[PDB]
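note to self: dont lose this again. the chain is below, predicted strucutre after it. 184 aa total, dont forget to put it in the shared folder this time
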Amino acid sequence: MQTAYVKYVDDTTGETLRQDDLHGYTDETIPYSTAEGIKKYEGDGYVLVSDGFKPGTKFGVGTPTYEVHFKHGMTHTDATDKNAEQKTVTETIHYVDENNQTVQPDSTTAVTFKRGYTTDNVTGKVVSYDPWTVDGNQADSKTFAAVPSPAVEGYTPNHQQINEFTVTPDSKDIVKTVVYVGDP
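---
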């Protein structure tokens, strides 16, 4: 009674997923197909790479192993997708007086960093990230244009303008207050 092995391998991790031990007499057709197995692992997120078994294969005399190789499926989500990773850093300028009351409308400017990534279909964990993008262009930071405090006759602000500031996706929002002093 001969033996034949059918070995399903995950090339990604290197592990064996399944091994089928088949038995029969020399010269008969092995009552087996790799169909069902391959179907089951594809539903798991795996991708076929090669299938060494072939229908019509008979039992000989050795102890042969036939291999079916798989790799992990990959799903790419890119920066324009709803699922992209997004980080927003905003800057707010308040314009007040001695009583901390509104003398000029707020200056507000926002930057949204977006990036795609790749997920492993089998494990479900993410394996890489695409470069950070700002409005569809590759960038890891952005400088906020320095903002000039507007002119209010009767007052003079304690900062003529607030500077440029560079921000990364990680950065904390910017809150800066300008105080206008009444003309003595």
